[PDB]
Every structure is written in structure tokens, then in C-alpha cells.
From a paper:
It was recently discovered that an insoluble hardwood lignin-preparation (LRP) is amenable to enzymatic hydrolysis by a glucuronoyl esterase (GE, EC 3.1.1.B11) releasing aldouronic acids. The overall fold of the catalytic domain of CuGE features a large ten-stranded twisted β-sheet flanked by α-helical elements and a surface-exposed active site.
Structures of ligand-bound complexes showed that the ligands bind in the highly accessible and solvent exposed binding site of molecule B only. The α-1,2-linked 4-O-methyl-d-glucuronoyl moiety is nested in the small substrate-binding pocket, that provides distinct recognition of all hydroxyl groups and a hydrophobic environment for accommodation of the 4-O-methyl-d-glucuronoyl substituent, while the xylan-backbone runs along the surface and displays only hydrophobic, van der Waals and water-mediated interactions with the protein. We observe that binding of aldouronic acids is coupled to a conformational change of R271 that allows the side chain to engage in substrate recognition and complete the formation of the oxyanion hole. Thus, the oxyanion hole is created solely by R271 with both the backbone amide and guanidinium side chain nitrogen atoms forming close contacts with the O6 carbonyl of the 4-O-methyl-glucuronoyl moiety (3.2 and 2.8 Å, respectively), mimicking the interactions in a tetrahedral reaction intermediate. In the complex formed at pH 7.5–8 (dΔS270A:U4mX), Y366 moves “out” upon substrate binding, and no significant differences are observed in substrate recognition interactions compared to the complexes formed at pH 5.5 (dΔS270A:Um4XX-OH and dΔS270A:XUm4XX-OH). MST measurements of ΔWT and dΔS270A respectively on aldotetrauronic acid (Um4XX-OH) indicate equilibrium dissociation constants in the mM range with a moderately stronger binding (one order of magnitude) between dΔS270A and Um4XX-OH compared to the active variant. The strong binding in dΔS270A:Um4XX-OH is in accordance with the well-defined binding observed in the complexes of CuGE.
Numbering used by the authors: 80 to 458
């Protein structure tokens, strides 16, 4: 129904941010339904240029569940048609007592996350580093995911992490005795795990609420804006450095980090893949490594997609200073809880959150230099 999905745009060359509202073939988006097809195209482009191949659900996915006290263990097996299998067993921390009729809402927290989780929400601890190692460039192709698909599989570590989240949600769908409301699943992570959580929410449509925390470069920052920051003297993480530091991106991305204008996506399109579902990301201006201006401009550009879909308040951004990396400032708890309350707890909470302190160091944000499109009202 979307036709043949384009996965490359060989002639692309755009120093500003790619236009969310124009397909690779030059067709303009017009309807809300068009966004589903555009999202599928962005997925293919992101896989091709920076994330590697995200495998589909494998033929074998088995799950069993057991509970001791308030801790559940979800034992998952995943297997291919060639008989290869891997296994992993995330745990779930439950609120006590009788659950809601449809089960507990749940946040999948990469290695526990760094946000406070309200008392009526269960927490699943996902050991993403075991699914795909992330110590340094030395970690390439190591982790459970690669014991299934092969150490030379093109998936980045973050794409392998997404795959694991998808198997977790498969297992939850198969395991009603885990007492989870599978329509009310969120995801969160901080720092490198916040890069991971954004990827999970973008690519796995069953996630109702995505919460990336101080994800920086390769998260809710854009590659093109971070290149501008580093060229003008801010000591930011950028595309060139990040592919040498770790294995969060595919080896193919190495071919583009010096040629960012030729990449027909940026992370504003990655973030927009969450639409029309909900996301709020949190940033910290104390660390220029995180590329503060790039995150504000990137999420401002991503925001236009929700605006065009008539659901601006489903996308939040809050950027402040004055606290340590991955420490949670109580000043932002109301904004976090507004999104959890609305999108996971079914409350009538307002979620209009889009704020920065503009503390961007040696650069400023100038929307007209980066965002070239007007926002259409998709019909
Ligand atoms: O050593 C790296 C190579 O492994 C990488 O190879 C790319 C992998 O994905 C394919 O789609 C590309 O065609 C191929 O070039 O190139 C970069 C290099 O650093
Ligand atoms: C352009 O590409 C999109 C996405 O694949 C597709 O939905 C649309 O039909 C294409 N346009 C034409 C004229 O085929």
C-alpha cells in the first residue's frame, strides 16, 4: 500500500535538514495516512545509512513467566529457521496488590533507566548491553543478538537492542499471566541508553510512550547541527567522533560521517518515527558533549511532524542545566509525570511541554537556517 519503499537516495545533497513532508520520490505528504508510508521509508533510509538491518520477528519466539515476591522473570527464547537460538530473561518489578483490569502499565527501562517511575507503573529491567555489547569499537558484533544472527550482521548495537525490545513485547503479548497492559508500554534510558531508547520507540510501534534522557549525539541531537556546533568551537560529540568511539551505528555509517549532506535523513526524522505515538525527551545544557543546540533544533524540526498531524502535545522536550549527567532534577518531575499520567495511566493530564534555557554556548539556534519547510495540515 506504500509501493516499493526506497532505501537509498544516491543523488541526495542537502546541507540543511531533510524535509519530513516529501518522500524520496518527490511526492508531497498530504494526508495523515501518508505519514505511515513516510515513516516506513524513513525506517528503510535510517537502516541503510546509519543503523543497519533490523531483522523481523524470527520464526521461533517462546516465553515463560515466573514470579517471586514482587519480581517477575520473563524467560524468552528466540530462534531462526536454521535451528539457531538464544535466550534472555529480563525481570519485572511490580507494584503490590490487585492490578488494574487490563494489567499494569509498564516501562521498559534500559539497564534500569535514570528517571523516577511512579508507584502504579511496573518496571522491566532490560540488560541491553548483553543483547549487544557497547564498551568501545572493540565490541563490534558481540552480544546475544549476534550469537543468533552472526557477528558480521549489519545491525548496529542500538538496532540489536531494538530487536530485543520487540521480542520482549512479543513475549508479553504471549504471556498474559505477566499481568501487563500491552497497550500501555513505555521505554526509557539515559545517556548511551537514551540513544537506545529513542531508537526503540522510533522503530517499535507497540511502544506507547518513549522517554530518552540526556541522549546527546546519536540520540535526540541531529548530525548536521552537531557538525555546525563542532565547527564553531563547541566541544560536542559529533558523527565523526562517535563511530570511532563505540558500535552504536552500522559500519556503513563510517562512509557518510564526513559527508552528512548526502544522507537523506537526520535524527529529527528518527524522532518523528515515533509519531503519532507519544515521546518526551530530556536534555542537560551543562555538558556541551551532549550538543545542546543540536538537540533543541533537532526536536523543534521533529515537532513539526506532530504539529502537521494535529497532535503537537504528544511530543515534549525539556532542556535545562544545573545538575549532574543522568541525575534527575526534581524541577522536571511534573513534566515527566504529565506524559506518564496521560499516555500510560489514562489520566486527563495536559502535556504541552517544549522548553529550553537557550544555553547553547558558542552558537545560536536560527530556525530559518535549518528548517526549510512549512508545516502542512495533513488531512
Ligand atoms: O570497514 C567498514 C566496512 O565494513 C563498511 O562496509 C559497508 C557495510 O555496509 C554496506 O552496506 C556497505 O556497502 C559497505 O561499504 O564500509 C566502511 C568501512 O569502515
Ligand atoms: C512515492 O513514494 C511513496 C512512498 O513509497 C509512495 O507512497 C508514492 O505512491 C510514490 N509516488 C508515486 C507517484 O508512485
Amino acid at each position: 500500500a506504500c509501493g516499493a519503499i526506497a532505501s537509498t537516495v544516491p543523488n541526495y545533497n542537502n546541507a540543511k535538514l531533510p524535509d519530513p513532508f516529501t518522500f524520496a520520490n518527490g511526492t508531497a505528504l498530504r494526508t495523515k495516512a501518508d505519514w505511515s508510508c513516510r515513516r516506513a521509508e524513513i525506517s528503510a533510509l535510517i537502516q541503510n545509512y546509519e543503523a543497519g538491518t533490523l531483522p523481523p520477528k524470527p520464526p521461533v519466539v517462546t516465553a515463560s513467566f515466573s514470579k517471586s515476591g514482587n519480581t517477575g522473570t520473563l524467560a524468552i527464547t528466540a530462534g531462526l529457521s536454521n535451528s539457531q537460538t538464544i535466550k534472555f530473561s529480563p525481570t519485572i518489578s511490580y507494584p503490590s496488590g490487585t492490578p488494574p483490569a487490563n494489567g499494569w502499565p509498564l516501562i521498559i527501562a534500559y539497564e534500569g533507566g535514570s528517571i523516577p517511575i511512579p508507584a502504579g507503573v511496573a518496571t522491566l529491567t532490560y540488560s541491553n548491553s548483553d543483547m549487544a555489547q557497547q564498551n568501545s569499537a572493540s565490541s563490534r558484533g558481540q552480544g546475544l543478538f549476534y550469537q543468533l544472527y552472526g557477528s558480521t550482521h549489519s545491525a548496529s548495537a542500538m538496532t540489536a537492542w531494538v530487536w530485543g525490545v520487540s521480542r520482549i513485547i512479543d513475549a508479553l503479548e504471549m504471556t498474559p499471566t505477566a499481568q501487563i497492559n500491552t497497550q500501555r508500554i513505555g521505554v526509557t534510558g539515559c545517556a548511551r541508553d537514551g540513544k537506545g531508547a529513542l531508537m526503540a520507540g522510533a522503530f517499535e510501534e507497540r511502544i506507547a510512550l518513549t522517554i530518552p534522557q540526556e541522549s546527546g549525539s546519536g540520540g535526540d541531537a541531529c548530525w548536521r547541527l552537531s557538525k555546525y556546533e563542532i565547527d564553531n568551537g563547541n566541544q560536542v560529540q559529533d558523527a565523526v567522533e562517535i563511530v570511532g568511539e563505540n558500535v552504536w551505528f552500522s559500519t556503513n555509517f563510517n562512509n557518510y560521517v564526513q559527508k552528512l549532506p548526502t544522507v537523506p535523513e537526520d535524527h529529527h526524522l528518527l524522532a518523528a518515527m515515533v509519531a503519532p505515538r507519544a515521546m518526551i525527551s530530556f536534555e542537560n545544557t551543562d555538558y556541551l558533549w551532549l550538543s545542546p543546540m543540536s538537540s533543541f533544533g533537532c526536536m523543534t524540526a521533529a515537532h513539526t511532524v506532530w504539529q502537521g498531524l494535529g497532535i503537537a502535545d504528544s511530543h515534549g522536550f525539556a532542556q535545562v542545566g544545573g545538575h549532574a549527567h543522568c541525575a534527575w532534577p526534581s524541577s522536571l518531575t511534573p513534566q515527566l509525570n504529565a506524559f506518564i499520567n496521560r499516555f500510560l495511566l489514562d489520566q486527563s493530564a495536559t502535556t504541552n511541554v517544549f522548553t529550553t534555557n537557550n544555553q547553547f554556548g558558542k552558537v545560536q539556534w536560527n530556525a530559518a537556517n535549518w528548517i526549510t519547510w512549512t508545516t502542512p495540515t495533513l488531512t
